[PDB]
Amino acid sequence: YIRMAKNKEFFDALEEIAESAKNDETLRNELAKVLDDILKTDPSDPEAFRKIVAEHQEFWDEHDPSLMEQYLKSDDFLNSTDPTYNFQKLHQFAAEQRVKLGLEKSDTDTLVAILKNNPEECRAYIESKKPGLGNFSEGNVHGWLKEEYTPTIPPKAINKSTGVLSDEAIKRIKEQARDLLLLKLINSSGNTQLLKDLRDAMSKPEAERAANALGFPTEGNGVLFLSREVVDALEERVEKLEQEAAKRGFDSYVQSLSHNALLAKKNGLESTTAAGFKNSLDEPYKTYLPESEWERAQGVLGARYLQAVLSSGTQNLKDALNAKDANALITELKKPALLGPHDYIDKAVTEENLGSLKKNMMKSFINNIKDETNLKALDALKALDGAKNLDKFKEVLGKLGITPADWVKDTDLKDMKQWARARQFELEINRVSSLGSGAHSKLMSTLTKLPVEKQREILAKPQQLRHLMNAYESHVAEHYLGKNASGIAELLTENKRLEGFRAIHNAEVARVLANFKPEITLNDKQVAAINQALTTANSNPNTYTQATDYKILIDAIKTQSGSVNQKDFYNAFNLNDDGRAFTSSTPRKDEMSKQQQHNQHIYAEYNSTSNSGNKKLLAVLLSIEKPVTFSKDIVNRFLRPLKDSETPQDYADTLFGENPTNPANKKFKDDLLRELTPTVFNEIKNDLRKQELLDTNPAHVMTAIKALSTELESIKGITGPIRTNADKLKFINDIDPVHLYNPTFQGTARSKAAQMKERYEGLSRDCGLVVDQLRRQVVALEGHLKSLPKEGEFKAAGLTLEQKAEIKKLRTDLEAELSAVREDLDFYKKIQGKLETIVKEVDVAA
Hints:
The chain contains 42 helices and 2 strands.
């Protein structure tokens, strides 16, 4: 080797200078000449060549003096045959370097065309862009050949000048072109998913499609390879787009948030830095929101979170509802009792907020109205429901603790009275049900959706809430609710699910099992075994103080629920997670004990008796919560009058009174009539009328076989006339056609048919009545011959041939009526329907 020369030093200098001409527009115009000349020269003419490189000495000395030192013409300092850097190389390299300098600022269409064209076609293309990408025409640069052309049908210009722009040189030119075309495409795409497909690809075939979709050409794909410069710029483009996307989308997303969602953002909103705040959002905003937005976004999401948490909370809101302006409402909400000292609440701003906020705070207030010392809750609420003026309101909102209340609008008066009524219901159902008002969510909805007036009615007559919890067929609900009122379907199925718990043998186990987070669903055989578990528990004299014996009661129930987390079960009954021992704060078990202590004497009969009629009356009794212990003498006083009482109401009255004076009684009468439905009371009754029919005296058997036969004759006298009129009322209106008419009076052409309508729908309302009546008799008749044992297992001393032929007379007569009445029920319904189709053809006709 040697090296005593400037040949590398010029390669290396040109290369640097070209880089610094990226952003120095005049230096490129200088460096283009330096090249434009070096190019014009013949390479293999060491005189002429070194003449031309020397004759730009002023431009050489301008970058680096250490290129220059009679010695210029001497090829001592400048090698003519360097193994790595000739004149042939420094000409070839200066050509590459020329076209590279030119495309650095050239348009998208050129950039494409260089990628589009093959090396041959690419050289000829460079000639057509003259002097843009150098002066590459014949004669103007030495190596440069004549343009040849292909033999293809549309001929394509090619230039086979490898001596100056080598095949490896035009690849490097395409390399540089690609990059710049991409940066052009990247900086101009708003389409973020495409950009991402490119950055996140892991194989040429989708690096392709991603590129091709941005506008990179199909022809370029061969050389498509991400440099680290294009990557770096791509990566920082998406982060730009996502941020200004997320900044824009936020104010919408906040409005999109559900109530529970809003509520979950608290830890976020209280965050002392933007990282935290941001970390509590959902994923677009969780990262790509910019921190600059934060202070603003605290407010936008804040004032929605102030609406949500103030609306739904239990905190005391007197002072904050009485706030003077926003500035005072703020200093109130920052108080530790409320939302705490946090910057976010300094976006509860006077403008839109403190109206909106106070209306929302008023919902909380009303819902946490409490039996205070001078005022009942139901009075306070009904005061608010009652009053008519805005000023008649402010008068009571005086007494509730809100002065001035001059902020209270007129429009809102209807909304906030609904909150007053809704709350009234909440309480009145809590008063009526052993269970929670929560346990009747669907019932609590349907009342809140009855129109303004009916609400006030059902509230003035609260006893029907009782009847509604015992409404299981839609017509029963309708009779108290409305015509076809909203949400009945759901109400009924609530009542069907609750009946298990409502008839469970202890009111604590009722409450918690009914109000479990996943919903449980029972069979009667499940609740049998649950009530069986509680009898073993009442048998055990330390179920509620020995933790291993409290477990025997829970372990028994557990199994019957059947399918949930063990732990919540145990905690919800005040035990630790294991079972091992009681949790320190022990209220659920405490009331269980208080209940199951009152079921001492009641259980004492429940176990003794074979009277599987009034077993059921005890079962309902111990399934109702009691203030007090219910002695052995009151169990006797409960069981006495049931035989002689005909209805549930007549049963209550003779126990307690017409309007029993003593509050603790009045409540238990109300609570007793809730569980003694007309339906279950009959079940008790004709169960205990099985009893007198199971007796060992024929004295008693027959004294109740005759009774029963008297009630059958009653039933036959209601059915009698309904039978004799039946054959008549059909034969007339069954063969009857329905295009026709019957005109027999005066009036208008349309009012003839209209009042012949009134006459048919009069008959439709007679049949309906009959239908209802026969419905009751089939229920009754069934009721009776359930009560009758069946030729066998009579468990009685000798029955004579007249006695045993009389009881068999009864069965057959009972079944022979039941069977018979069905004829008519069927038939009367046919006539029912038959009219409905005649009445609604007079509608479409007249």
